[PDB]
Structures are given as structure tokens and as C-alpha cells.
Design an enzyme around this catalytic site. Structure first.
Site, PDB file in Angstrom:
ATOM      1  N   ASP B  73      17.122  15.813  12.770  1.00 53.86           N
ATOM      2  CA  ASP B  73      18.014  16.823  13.379  1.00 53.86           C
ATOM      3  C   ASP B  73      18.905  16.182  14.465  1.00 53.86           C
ATOM      4  O   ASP B  73      20.134  16.177  14.341  1.00 53.86           O
ATOM      5  CB  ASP B  73      17.238  18.066  13.922  1.00 53.86           C
ATOM      6  N   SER B 124      14.863  10.777 -20.355  1.00 57.33           N
ATOM      7  CA  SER B 124      14.879   9.892 -21.545  1.00 57.33           C
ATOM      8  C   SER B 124      13.723   8.859 -21.516  1.00 57.33           C
ATOM      9  O   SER B 124      13.728   7.900 -22.306  1.00 57.33           O
ATOM     10  CB  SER B 124      16.247   9.179 -21.628  1.00 57.33           C
ATOM     11  N   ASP B 175       3.630   8.995  -6.901  1.00 61.39           N
ATOM     12  CA  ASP B 175       4.298   8.559  -5.661  1.00 61.39           C
ATOM     13  C   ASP B 175       4.190   7.039  -5.508  1.00 61.39           C
ATOM     14  O   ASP B 175       3.219   6.419  -5.979  1.00 61.39           O
ATOM     15  CB  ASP B 175       3.705   9.276  -4.408  1.00 61.39           C
ATOM     16  N   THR B 177       5.382   5.206  -2.031  1.00 62.32           N
ATOM     17  CA  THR B 177       5.985   5.038  -0.691  1.00 62.32           C
ATOM     18  C   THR B 177       5.039   4.243   0.296  1.00 62.32           C
ATOM     19  O   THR B 177       4.828   4.683   1.429  1.00 62.32           O
ATOM     20  CB  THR B 177       6.347   6.460  -0.098  1.00 62.32           C
ATOM     21  N   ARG B 188     -10.601  -1.883  10.145  1.00 60.42           N
ATOM     22  CA  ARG B 188     -11.413  -0.685  10.409  1.00 60.42           C
ATOM     23  C   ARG B 188     -12.902  -1.053  10.337  1.00 60.42           C
ATOM     24  O   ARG B 188     -13.650  -0.789  11.286  1.00 60.42           O
ATOM     25  CB  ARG B 188     -11.085   0.445   9.393  1.00 60.42           C
ATOM     26  N   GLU B 344      28.733  -9.079  -7.530  1.00 63.11           N
ATOM     27  CA  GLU B 344      27.905  -7.852  -7.629  1.00 63.11           C
ATOM     28  C   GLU B 344      27.125  -7.660  -6.314  1.00 63.11           C
ATOM     29  O   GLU B 344      26.017  -7.106  -6.292  1.00 63.11           O
ATOM     30  CB  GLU B 344      26.938  -7.958  -8.854  1.00 63.11           C
ATOM     31  N   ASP B 349      19.147 -11.547  -8.908  1.00 59.73           N
ATOM     32  CA  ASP B 349      17.893 -12.256  -8.603  1.00 59.73           C
ATOM     33  C   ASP B 349      16.721 -11.290  -8.779  1.00 59.73           C
ATOM     34  O   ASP B 349      15.814 -11.541  -9.581  1.00 59.73           O
ATOM     35  CB  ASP B 349      17.916 -12.853  -7.165  1.00 59.73           C
ATOM     36  N   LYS B 350      16.753 -10.207  -7.971  1.00 55.69           N
ATOM     37  CA  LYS B 350      15.947  -8.987  -8.168  1.00 55.69           C
ATOM     38  C   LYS B 350      14.412  -9.194  -7.978  1.00 55.69           C
ATOM     39  O   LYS B 350      13.681  -8.208  -7.842  1.00 55.69           O
ATOM     40  CB  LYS B 350      16.263  -8.390  -9.580  1.00 55.69           C
ATOM     41  N   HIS B 353      14.065 -10.779 -14.029  1.00 56.30           N
ATOM     42  CA  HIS B 353      15.155 -11.039 -14.985  1.00 56.30           C
ATOM     43  C   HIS B 353      14.675 -10.632 -16.390  1.00 56.30           C
ATOM     44  O   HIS B 353      15.432 -10.038 -17.160  1.00 56.30           O
ATOM     45  CB  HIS B 353      15.577 -12.536 -14.929  1.00 56.30           C
ATOM     46  N   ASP B 391     -48.147   5.723  -5.572  1.00 58.58           N
ATOM     47  CA  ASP B 391     -49.074   4.599  -5.854  1.00 58.58           C
ATOM     48  C   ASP B 391     -48.490   3.633  -6.898  1.00 58.58           C
ATOM     49  O   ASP B 391     -49.027   2.540  -7.094  1.00 58.58           O
ATOM     50  CB  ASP B 391     -50.430   5.165  -6.369  1.00 58.58           C
ATOM     51  N   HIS B 392     -47.402   4.076  -7.574  1.00 59.27           N
ATOM     52  CA  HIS B 392     -46.749   3.364  -8.705  1.00 59.27           C
ATOM     53  C   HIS B 392     -47.695   3.267  -9.941  1.00 59.27           C
ATOM     54  O   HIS B 392     -47.453   2.480 -10.866  1.00 59.27           O
ATOM     55  CB  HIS B 392     -46.189   1.977  -8.257  1.00 59.27           C
ATOM     56  N   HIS B 434     -54.258  25.853   4.523  1.00 62.93           N
ATOM     57  CA  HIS B 434     -53.941  25.197   5.819  1.00 62.93           C
ATOM     58  C   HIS B 434     -52.643  25.759   6.427  1.00 62.93           C
ATOM     59  O   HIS B 434     -51.886  26.472   5.759  1.00 62.93           O
ATOM     60  CB  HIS B 434     -53.815  23.661   5.615  1.00 62.93           C
TER      61      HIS B 434
END
EC number: 3.1.3.1
Lengths: 280, 471, 280
Positions: B73, B124, B175, B177, B188, B344, B349-350, B353, B391-392, B434
């Protein structure tokens, strides 16, 4: 001392060459001067010059460092870690290179030159974006550099990037410890996943269908007649991508009820409960 | 058994675990047996059409919206200032290299206004490019991948880029960004190196190909719908294999339904699309996210015993294994000359290619890890449970089946059976009447309404549906 | 010269007094001659003799050493560690003590009656005994101590007891951070119990009685209605006194279904599943 080596010319590309075609020239001379393929120390030093030019013209950052060099004349400030040289013997490169990357010259194959600063970086990432991943540039420790990591990750677990850490000869490299988003349902092991499937008790008994939302699309799970909680699925080809196909999603079954019911539903559920009380 | 009496830890040392039968990463198992995987012929995302719904309507949410969040603003500017550029620098002098990049607050560029409302389907896009995808090259030998060390270096600036947006998406791209991918060191926390990853892969970047074009990022439209578009699901058995799924669809209901099956008791409710063979809302779990990380464990540190890893190709097959040739790429034969290229701004280079795969980009690379991305760690199983978690057992209580064998007894592994029997366990569990008995159930269900009214306050609601279970 | 300290008479009990009588004797004199409130040398040296008496008569072995001395004439052999003297003033107490326990007066690695330092250890305690409250036989480092645990002792309760910390004749001021056992029913934490409840779907929805295990034997508990898996059933009055007055129970729900079914029950289950799925 001002012995500016034209990295394009070292690779045999012009002062206009795209980063990709620079990499093509690299591949040509990386086949030609390949240390063990061509048993010639001469070709290994020439291969170092190929890897020098590529070290400064591989990634968006390094590329634009050279492109801004001869406008900027002062070498880049040292990124708190070092300049990454994955397979590039920085120590045996030019004094020009020793200017431009001086304050963080690594020591890759310099035999001692530094101890590898094991650069462990945490990263907020998604499971679908673990599936995606791909060829992308990360800025870690003041050091922007691009890598294609293997698509796939598990909460708290580590992604290796060999050589691409801080200063050192003994491989320090980059170690991406993933911080998964509020969505860590699919726990990876190799290509195989481990999530939990919310299966309604009536659907579990009849052997109907329950949707598991997967990385590339929502799978509709066919349940066997009468399933208990603690059972496990292996959804064939619903893991991360492999040569023969994707891995297997392991779903831990929970048998769950909608709490609230209609008069019809609740009535039959109570008759089942009466059948249970009748066992005593 | 009757433990009762106890001991003490003292914390003199950390008890290390014992190794078990694990890691068959040497005889490669392809796992393509009964895999299905590619059963649907292509499919892709069905995003295209000569406009279909949302035109003019577009869901009008937010007061105008226009420039979402970063309105700025200037003369009514507040709050967002402190987030970034709370100083500016100098209006002119040196810092002010520009002053009006808005230009009357946006001229007629095309339409502008951001918003993200006009259309979501008319494009497209082939709708097959789900951002990017890569396999672990080939099946190969597997194994050898361990590596893990730790970190003498931790923390940095911060770079909390996006922190809500960025590389988030949903199935397909929605998205983008952030910085580009992500951006920061462990700033962290960090659990442990070999704690969370005894074997971290990294040398596996496949190959890529058939691209040379990626300018169409827009799969669908923008932000709210930038990818996916339309992906319906309705099939007999797309699942896979588990327990004993006999090929049976079931669950139809169509028998009488009082008057008729298609809604009947309801005519219409807004839109909803509930009672459509499957819907309502359903599907638990969704974010899941455990707050309990089990353990951190800062051990098995450095360990530079990994001999093979800094070797860039040596005794390999050939860099023409993966697909051999996808198309051409290197020699694309697009134009007779190297374009027109006058001025251009710069050259194209971009950072790109035609992409074009690197030398030995994915084919063993001596270490063999180019064809591997781990496989074993802790599958968990869970069937080790049920067999007396006190006791396994150790014979006596149960001697013939240790586990897996329970088939005559049925139950099929079970694992979740904290009670079932458990108590007594062929031993003297005294029990008797009990004081420990004392209980008063105040779990979900018997709360408010029927119990003692709503509560001892004007906090009261008439929200009680009888004919249907609803709040 | 073996000046028989009548440890009983010091505690104000007869030479037929049990560990119980020794305990309430010590407590009476520990409140009366409590040197923190009544800082008066006479009462404090006297209190230390009461701690000499209690020192020997606190632990089952050291107790039996006194009892056997005057029947057996030789000092009963020191445990693998030595003779404990839990933070008591060894160098001020009787010749009788320092001659009977002399041959093995601990002292850690110093041996000459040196003090033990503060330490923090984890006390794995049986849930049943945590309910009951009383003397607990804890054996470690050669010493078998009788530590009186609080009635209804909850996770993280630190019993600061000298005698099991750093190595010494009056050994270290230990912090017993009570870790209640991985006993298959509960883990009392904060003020409340954490258990598991595997419950079948009819009994979960309608709310019928299952056998739920408790610290003094299993009891029949009518499960709440509309009980869904992945949730925690709050049962008040099961947990122990604390912040919330008393604590609750939280049952980790894992719903199961009958697996084996007869035609009619299977017809009811499917009709639920059809009127569910198709009309979701």
C-alpha cells in the site's frame, strides 16, 4: 596472481556458451582424460583442468561468480563452511583459482589440506516432494549449489551429497536431515513405505474398500474378508520409483468405528454384542 | 511371573543392542513379481478442456484480495513492514536505485491483479510432468552403502524460507516459492547420524532424458490449483497383496432401501456429494505427526572406514546401460545454425539448453550405489508381540510355537493382544478383592446432554440428533 | 576394643526388635532430635549415634552382620564393593563400628573412609509395589538397600538417598529418578496410568465388559460406548493422588473383529458394511 584462465576455452566452448553446453564439453573431456580409463597422469592433470572449469561453471552460483568476475574483481567472501569441490582437486588447480576460491580452498585430493567439514543441513520437505525432488539448487551455510538427490526420504533420516560440504580432503560432504511437514504418514525404507490405514470395522469384515492417499494418486485398498488391527498391507508399486517399478507401501491396519450410527446400524451392532456376551 | 523386587541402573554406560538377520542387499531381488505398478495405460492427469465451470464465479473469497498478503500500500502500510525491509535503506541518496517499480500501481500489462481466480482447466499442458521423477537407475548388485558420520558444524543464519508455502504441493506441483528447493544448515535440532540412518544413499541421480523443454510449469493454473486437476479413483483392487484378499468387491446395499437406493430419504443438500457409493468425509490419520521422536542417540560417530566412495568411475560396464539412448538430446538436429541470437539481453544460458545426462550419471560408478538407495533398517514386523510381554514365555507357558507357526490356532500373527489372555500366565497371580479396583469411566461418549444436562453454566446447546448420529 | 554399641538401645528398642521396630524408632528420634529444627550439638551428636545404629540396621546384610556378631566372632565378609555407610559421619562414630566394619570400610578406591559424591540413577520400580508403598529391596554395586518408596509413587519422583551414588564409605548422594517398569499393563506418569485395551468392535460400540488388568489383579471393566481405535479411554479413580486430586487411566484402543464367522453373523456384518460403504 592475475593468471585468469578462460574456463570456456579449457572446455573448448566459446564466450557465450550455455551452462548445459559447457557441461557437454566437460563430458567430452571427462571421457577423454578419465583417470582410470586413460592410464596417464598427464591426462589426470588435464582432467583436473576440465574439473576446474566445471567446478566454476557447473551450478547457477559458481556460473554467475565467473560471469560477474571481470566486473567484480575481489574474490567472493568465504561461505561459513567452504567452497564445495565434489571430485574436483582444488589444491592442484591454478593460483588464479587459489585467488578466486582462496579463503575456502577445501583440499579435496590435497591429501591433508583441511579436515572435511561434515556439513549436516536440516530441510522442511514433503513426501510427494520427496517423490518429486529432482534437479534443484539448495543454499546451505552461505553456499548455493545444485544437486539431483535420489527421489525419496523418511522423517529425521539423512540424504548424502558426496563431496558437496565444507573445507576438507577426508569427505565432509552435505548431509540433508529431513524435517517432514504435518503430513509424515509414509515412513521410508529403501523404496518401501510405512503408513497407517483407517479401516472401518464393517468394511474390514466384509472385505470392501478404503482409500489410502498416495504420492502420485489416491489408491483404493481392497480389504480381505475379516481384518484385525495390527495386520499389514504391501501395496505393490506404491512406494518411491525404481528400475523394475515403485516400492511397496506398508499400511498398518486400524480397525475403527464411526462412533455415531443410525437406528438400523446400531441395532445390528448391539445384536453382534449380544452374540459376544452369549460366549460367557 | 512374580517379579515384585527390583534393581538400579546407575547410568555407568549405554547398553548397546545385538545384531539380527538383516540386509539381503547383495542378491538383488527386483520385487516386480505380482507388482502391477503400470496397469493403467498411461492415465496422466486429466487437465484440459474448452472451459468447464468456475468461469465468472471463481469462488469470491477475501475482500477483493487482489495482491494477496504483499499489498504493501505505502500510505496505509503497517505490520508487514516489520517482516522485511523495515528501514528501506535510503529514498534516493545511494540505496534508492529505483523509486516507482509499480508504475501508477500496475499498468495494463495483460490483466495483472494476481488473484488466481479466472479458470483452472483451459491449458495445453500434457499433464504428465509431475515436477520431476527419478529411479535408482538399474537393479545392479545393491548394498555397501553405509557412509554415515555426524557433524562438527551445526547452525547458521536461519533462512526460514516459505515456512508454510514453498516446495509443499499436493501429489503434483501446487506451489514453488522457496529459495529454489530448500535453504539452511541444522539450525533448529538434529536426532543423530547412524541413529536415524545407518546407511544414507546419495550417489543415485538416475539419468533423465526426453526433456529439453520444461517452460510449462503450469499443470492446471495457479496457487489454489497449479497441478493435479482431476484424478478420480474407482477400481476393483488397485491395492496389491496382504493376508488373503480373495478377489471380491462386495458392499453394494441394493436390496430394497425402503423406497429407493439413490438418496430417497434426502432430495438435496447444497452440493455435498455424500452417499455416492463412498464419501461422507471419512479417512482418519491425515497429518498424523508424532511429537515423541523415540530417541536422539549421538553415537556411531565419524567412522571414516568407508574406503570405496570418492572414486568417480573405474571398473564399470559402460555409460550406455540406462535406456541406452532415450532419443538423441546431444545431437537434437533442431536448427541448421546456432539460432539467430542478436541481443536477447544475454545468450540463452538459462542453466539449461537441453538438460543432457552427465558422463556415467547413473551406472554403478564403481561403488555400485548408483543403482541403489538402501533397502533395510527396521521393517519392525510386530509379530514378535503377544508371546507374554512380561516373562517372554521361554517355553513352559508356550513351547511349540515361538511365533509365525500359529495357523491351526488361526489369528494370523495378531501382534495387538495386550490382554487376550496375558494375565495369570500359568503363574501365581493372587489377585483377590483389593483396593486397586477403584474406577470411574469418564471417556468420550457419556459426557453432557443425557448425563446431568450440559453443564453447571449457561454453556448449553440443543445439539442432539436422534434419527441420525450427528452433533 | 569392641565396645558393643547396643544399636537397639540407641534407637530406644529391645535387642529383639525387627527392621520395622528399628524404623519407627529411628523416625521418632528423627522428628524429636531433628537437627534441622533443633540445631543443638548434644541432640545432633546423639542423632548421629541414632544414624550409626540405623546405618547398620537399615540394610538386610549389615543388619545380619550386627545380629551374627556375638555368635560368630569374625566380622561377616564385606559385599563386592565394601561396607556402605549412607552419608553418615564415619570418622566421628564408635571404635566398635570402625573395627567390625573396619576390614571392609568401602571408601571407594580410597578405602580410608572417604565420602561419595552426588550422582543421579534410574530406579526401575514394580507397578504393584508402587501402589502398595513401603520398604523396597534394591540391590546394586554390592549393596542391597531398603529404600522406603512413597505410597503411590509416580514417574520422575526423585528419592534423594546417600549410599548408592559416587564411590565412598559414606557413599554418594544419589537421585533415584523412579522409572516404573515396562510391566505389560500400566506406566504411571504425572498422576495417571497409561495402559492398552484390545477390544472387539461390537463391545467397543455398545460398551460391554472386558477383563482389564490392574495392579492387584484383573477386574471386569464395562468399556465406554463408541470406543474408536487410536484413542485413549479416560477412566478416573484408577490413577494415583497428584495435581488433578487423583489421576485417570488412558487405555490405548486397538479394536479387533471375530475373524471366524458363522453365516447369520456374517450376514449382519455385511449388511452393516453395505449400508455403511454405499451410503457413506
Amino acid at each position: 596472481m592475475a593468471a585468469k584462465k578462460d574456463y570456456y576455452a579449457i572446455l573448448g566452448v566459446p564466450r557465450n556458451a550455455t551452462q548445459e553446453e559447457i557441461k557437454r564439453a566437460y563430458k567430452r573431456l571427462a571421457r577423454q582424460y578419465h583417470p582410470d580409463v586413460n592410464k596417464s597422469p598427464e591426462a589426470e592433470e588435464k582432467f583436473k583442468e576440465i574439473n576446474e572449469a566445471y567446478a566454476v561453471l557447473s551450478d547457477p552460483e559458481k556460473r554467475r561468480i565467473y560471469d560477474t568476475y571481470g566486473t567484480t574483481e575481489a574474490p567472493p567472501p568465504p561461505p561459513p563452511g567452504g567452497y564445495d569441490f565434489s571430485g574436483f582437486d582444488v589444491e592442484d588447480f591454478s593460483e588464479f583459482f587459489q585467488e578466486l576460491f582462496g579463503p575456502g580452498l577445501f583440499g579435496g585430493f590435497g591429501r591433508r589440506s583441511r579436515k572435511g567439514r561434515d556439513l549436516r543441513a536440516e530441510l522442511p520437505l514433503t513426501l510427494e516432494e520427496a517423490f518429486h525432488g529432482g534437479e534443484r539448487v539448495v543454499e546451505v551455510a552461505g553456499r548455493r549449489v545444485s544437486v539431483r538427490i535420489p527421489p525419496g526420504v523418511r522423517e529425521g533420516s539423512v540424504i548424502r551429497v558426496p563431496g558437496m560440504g565444507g573445507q576438507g580432503n577426508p569427505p565432509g560432504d552435505l548431509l540433508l536431515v529431513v524435517r517432514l511437514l504435518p503430513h509424515p504418514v509414509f515412513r521410508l525404507e529403501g523404496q518401501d513405505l510405512y503408513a497407517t490405514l483407517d479401516v472401518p470395522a464393517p468394511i474390514a469384515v466384509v472385505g470392501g474398500k478404503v482409500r489410502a492417499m498416495t504420492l502420485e494418486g489416491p489408491v483404493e485398498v481392497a480389504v480381505p474378508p475379516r481384518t484385525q488391527a495390527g495386520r499389514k498391507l504391501r501395496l505393490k508399486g506404491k512406494g518411491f520409483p525404481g528400475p523394475a517399478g515403485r516400492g511397496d507401501l506398508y499400511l498398518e491396519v486400524r480397525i475403527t468405528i464411526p462412533e455415531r450410527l443410525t437406528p438400523e446400524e446400531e441395532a445390528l451392532w448391539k445384536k453382534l454384542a449380544e452374540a459376544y456376551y452369549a460366549r460367557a | 511371573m512374580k517379579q515384585s523386587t527390583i534393581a538400579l541402573a546407575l547410568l555407568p554406560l549405554l547398553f548397546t543392542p545385538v545384531t539380527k538377520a538383516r540386509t539381503p542387499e547383495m542378491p538383488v531381488l527386483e520385487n516386480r513379481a505380482a507388482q502391477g505398478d503400470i496397469t493403467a495405460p498411461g492415465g496422466a492427469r486429466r487437465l484440459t478442456g474448452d472451459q468447464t465451470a468456475a468461469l465468472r464465479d471463481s469462488l469470491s473469497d477475501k475482500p477483493a484480495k487482489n495482491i494477496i498478503l504483499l499489498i504493501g500500500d505505502g500510505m496505509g502500510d503497517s505490520e508487514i513492514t516489520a517482516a522485511r525491509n523495515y528501514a528501506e535503506g535510503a529514498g534516493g541518496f545511494f540505496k534508492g536505485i529505483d523509486a516507482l517499480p509499480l508504475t501508477g500501481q500496475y499498468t495494463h500489462y495483460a490483466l495483472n491483479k494476481k488473484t488466481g481466480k479466472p479458470d483452472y482447466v483451459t491449458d495445453s499442458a500434457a499433464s504428465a510432468t509431475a515436477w520431476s521423477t527419478g529411479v535408482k537407475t538399474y537393479n545392479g548388485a545393491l548394498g555397501v552403502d553405509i557412509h554415515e558420520k555426524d557433524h562438527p558444524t551445526i547452525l547458521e543464519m536461519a533462512k526460514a524460507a516459505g515456512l508454510a508455502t514453498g516446495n509443499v504441493s499436493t501429489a503434483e506441483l501446487q506451489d514453488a516459492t522457496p529459495a529454489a528447493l530448500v535453504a539452511h544448515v541444522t539450525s533448529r535440532k538434529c536426532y543423530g547420524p547412524s541413529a536415524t540412518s545407518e546407511k544414507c544413499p546419495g550417489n543415485a541421480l538416475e539419468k533423465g532424458g526426453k526433456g529439453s523443454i520444461t517452460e510449462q510449469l503450469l499443470n492446471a493454473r495457479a496457487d489454489v490449483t497449479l497441478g493435479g486437476g482431476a484424478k478420480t479413483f474407482a477400481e476393483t483392487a488397485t491395492a496389491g497383496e496382504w493376508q488373503g484378499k480373495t478377489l471380491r468387491e462386495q458392499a453394494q446395499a441394493r436390496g430394497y432401501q425402503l423406497v429407493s437406493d439413490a438418496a430417497s430419504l434426502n432430495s438435496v443438500t447444497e452440493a455435498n456429494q455424500q452417499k455416492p457409493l463412498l464419501g461422507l468425509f471419512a479417512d482418519g490419520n491425515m497429518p498424523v505427526r508424532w511429537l515423541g521422536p523415540k530417541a536422539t542417540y549421538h553415537g556411531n560417530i565419524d567412522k571414516p572406514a568407508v574406503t570405496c566412495t570418492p572414486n568417480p568411475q573405474r571398473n564399470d560396464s559402460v555409460p550406455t546401460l540406462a535406456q541406452m539412448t532415450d532419443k538423441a538430446i546431444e545431437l537434437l538436429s533442431k536448427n541448421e545454425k546456432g539460432f539467430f541470437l542478436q541481443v536477447e539481453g544475454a545468450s540463452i544460458d538459462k542453466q539449461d539448453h537441453a538438460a543432457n545426462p552427465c558422463g556415467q550419471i547413473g551406472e554403478t560408478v564403481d561403488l555400485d550405489e548408483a543403482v541403489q538407495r538402501a533397502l533395510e533398517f527396521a521393517k519392525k514386523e510386530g509379530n514378535t508381540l503377544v508371546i507374554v510381554t512380561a516373562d517372554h514365555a521361554h517355553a513352559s507357558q508356550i513351547v511349540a510355537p515361538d511365533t509365525k507357526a500359529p495357523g491351526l490356532t488361526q489369528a494370523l500373527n495378531t501382534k495387538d493382544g495386550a490382554v487376550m489372555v496375558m494375565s495369570y500366565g500359568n503363574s501365581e497371580e493372587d489377585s483377590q478383592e483389593h483396593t486397586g479396583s477403584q474406577l470411574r469411566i469418564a471417556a468420550y461418549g457419556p459426557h453432557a446432554a443425557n448425563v446431568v444436562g450440559l453443564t453447571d453454566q449457561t454453556d448449553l446447546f440443543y445439539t442432539m440428533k436422534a434419527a441420525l448420529g450427528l452433533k
